[PDB]
Amino acid sequence: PAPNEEQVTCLKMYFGHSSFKPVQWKVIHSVLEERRDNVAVMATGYGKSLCFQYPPVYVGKIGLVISPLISLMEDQVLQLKMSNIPACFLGSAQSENVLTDIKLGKYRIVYVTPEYCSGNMGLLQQLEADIGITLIAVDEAHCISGHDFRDSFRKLGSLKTALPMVPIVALTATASSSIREDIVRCLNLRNPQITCTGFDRPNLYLEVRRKTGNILQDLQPFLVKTSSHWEFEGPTIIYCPSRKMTQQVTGELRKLNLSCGTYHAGMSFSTRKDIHHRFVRDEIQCVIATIAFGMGINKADIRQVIHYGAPKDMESYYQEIGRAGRDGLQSSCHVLWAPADINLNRHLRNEKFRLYKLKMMAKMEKYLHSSRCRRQIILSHFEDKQVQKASLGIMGTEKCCDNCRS
Ligand SMILES: Nc1ncnc2c1ncn2[C@@H]1O[C@H](COP(=O)(O)OP(=O)(O)OP(O)(O)=S)[C@@H](O)[C@H]1O
Ligand SMILES: Fc1ccc(Cn2cnc3ccccc32)cc1
Ligand SMILES: [Mg+2]
Ligand SMILES: [Zn+2]
């Protein structure tokens, strides 16, 4: 099947896009016409959000979005309103006036937490009967299972029973052929369409280097002197394994009067939002951050990602380097590591998760020591069968990785 004129005019008018990506249309058609439950594993930057934002905008109904990343949900609600798409966050602290506007059908996309959703199942059935619920989205779906687990998700299996004619579309960036199964069981999904995309980001050069023991010695090669001032080549994210390491790296970089901000769960949500927004507005050139639950760094032109210390697992590496080069322009992702890092990772839920993570960590140590193409290694772990001409054209060249360089 193919999109009709009204479909393409809606996508361009409200989202600014000329065409639907292949798996984006496989999910949208399935929800819009077949009303079927969906599981979609798409690459970092592909555009999973359109799969849940577009269908309610086209039919003029309501979409229920469940997402853990509070800060970027606030960015998306503000983003939707700016694109003339009425959207809001529905919670217990929301006004009576905004809640009556939802009951009237004046809001296309409504964002809720798992707790609110379970505690207000009667409102959901009232919205379904009176207005109609196009779909119920579970963003970062790999959490109900896996390299990350959240038990708040478990109380969402009661949604299918209450709303059997409403499709649940669970979207994620990291989920293997076994991960998508336990999501179907915990959500009680009925014969869902299981879709996968290619996993390459060909505009991301890859390099692995050994740590010298001195922070400024390790990071100085990434810095350029512009007038008489030291700075990065462009917007940069430095990922650190601990909140303490984030503080030490920021401390050393501030001796060079570098424009940067730190980002960790030790800071309040308010201080975090400020740093993220200063990074997006290009007021800060570098963010030194830790990968911890509920956090995210969304920017379209990140030119460098530095992992200061060995990454946790292959899912962590993929999910973290995918923040670079969303504009399609040349970017770099460097790992600075030491064997002491991997031993620390060995110590820091279910036994299946532990075995899966330990397998990806042994793969991680192999990846770091390896003399083969970094790009060839990464795509084999996810058994990627959509490794296209664009990827093959970059492999074996200077722009691919450090091991492809002469
Ligand atoms: N059909 C499309 N045509 C062109 N650009 C698109 C299309 N769909 C999505 N995009 C763009 O792709 C980018 C995707 O950004 P995000 O929505 O953050 O991606 P994502 O896959 O949800 O990744 P994260 O890492 O989870 S935030 C945005 O610039 C979108 O506007
Ligand atoms: F380096 C790696 C690259 C991919 C995976 C497997 N994987 C993880 N998340 C995925 C999302 C979509 C498709 C596959 C995926 C493992 C290691
Ligand atoms: Mg997403
Ligand atoms: Zn290579």
Q: Which of 145, 379, 382, 385 best tests ligand 2's pocket when mutated (most atoms within 8 Å of CB)?
A: 382
- The experimental method, as deposited, was X-ray
Pocket lining: 266 vs ligand 1, CB cutoff 6 Å: no
The closest of 154, 184, 148 to 169, measured between CA atoms, is 184
In the sheet that holds 331-337, the strands lie side by side as 204-210, 331-337, 304-308, 236-240, 286-290, 260-263
Three-class DSSP labels, the chain: CCCCHHHHHHHHHHHCCCCCCHHHHHHHHHHHCCCCCEEEECCCCCCCCHHHHHHHHHHCCEEEEECCCHHHHHHHHHHHHHCCCCEEECCCCCCHHHHHHHHHCCCCEEEECHHHHHHCHHHHHHHHHHCCEEEEEEECHHHCCCCCCCHHHHHHCCHHHHCCCCCEEEEECCCCCCHHHHHHHHHCCCCCEEEECCCCCCCEEEEEEECCCCHHHHHHHHEEECCCCEEECCCEEEEECCHHHHHHHHHHHHCCCCCEEEECCCCCHHHHHHHHHHHHCCCCCEEEEECCCCCCCCCCCCCEEEEECCCCCHHHHHHHHCCCCCCCCCEEEEEEECHHHHHHHHHCCCHHHHHHHHHHHHHHHHHHHCCCCHHHHHHHHCCCCCCCHHHHHHCCCCCCEHHHCC
Pocket lining: 86 vs ligand 1, CB cutoff 6 Å: no
Classify burial at 398, counting beta carbons within 10 Å of its beta carbon; exposed 0-12, middle 13-18, buried 19 or more.
exposed
Pocket lining: 17 vs ligand 1, CB cutoff 6 Å: yes
Q: Which residues contact 177 (CB under 8 A, 6 or more apart)?
A: 383
Pocket lining: 87 vs ligand 1, CB cutoff 6 Å: no
Classify burial at 252, counting beta carbons within 10 Å of its beta carbon; exposed 0-12, middle 13-18, buried 19 or more.
middle
User: How many angstroms does the Cα of residue 195 sit away from the middle of ligand 3?
Assistant: 15
Side-chain-side CA neighbours of 48 within 13 Å: the count stands at: 24
- Confirm or deny that 260 is annotated as ligand binding: no
Q: Tokens standing for 42?
A: 């798409």
Q: Are 104 and 134 a contacting pair, CB within 8 Å?
A: no
CATH fold of 204-404, please? Rossmann fold (3.40.50)
Q: Which residues contact 60 (CB under 8 A, 6 or more apart)?
A: 108
Instruction: List 62's β-bridge partners, or say none.
Output: 133
Q: Which CATH superfamily is domain 5-196 in?
A: P-loop containing nucleotide triphosphate hydrolases (3.40.50.300)
The closest of 43, 44, 65, 45 to 54, measured between CA atoms, is 65
C-alpha–C-alpha distance, residues 65 and 13, integer Å = 22
Pocket lining: 195 vs ligand 2, CB cutoff 6 Å: no
The closest of 366, 382, 376, 363 to 402, measured between CA atoms, is 376
**Residue 339 CB neighbours (<10 A):** 12
| Residue ranges of the chain that CATH labels 3.40.50.300 | 5-196, 204-404
Q: What is the distance of C-alpha 286 from the center of its chain? A: 19
Instruction: List 286's β-bridge partners, or say none.
Output: 236, 260
- Confirm or deny that 146 is annotated as ligand binding: no
C-alpha–C-alpha distance, residues 337 and 286, integer Å = 20
The closest of 274, 285, 201 to 238, measured between CA atoms, is 285
Pocket lining: 298 vs ligand 1, CB cutoff 6 Å: yes
- Nearest CA owner, ligand 2 atom 7: 382
- Confirm or deny that 19 is annotated as ligand binding: yes
Q: Which amino acid is at 347?
A: H
Resolution in A: 2.2
Side-chain-side CA neighbours of 279 within 13 Å: the count stands at: 26
User: How many angstroms does the Cα of residue 217 sit away from the middle of ligand 3?
Assistant: 36
Q: Are 129 and 165 a contacting pair, CB within 8 Å?
A: no
C-alpha–C-alpha distance, residues 311 and 293, integer Å = 16
Q: Tokens standing for 229?
A: 């001032």
Residue listed under structure tokens 């201080």: 271
C-alpha–C-alpha distance, residues 360 and 235, integer Å = 29
Classify burial at 149, counting beta carbons within 10 Å of its beta carbon; exposed 0-12, middle 13-18, buried 19 or more.
middle
Pocket lining: 147 vs ligand 1, CB cutoff 6 Å: no
User: How many angstroms does the Cα of residue 121 sit away from the middle of ligand 3?
Assistant: 25
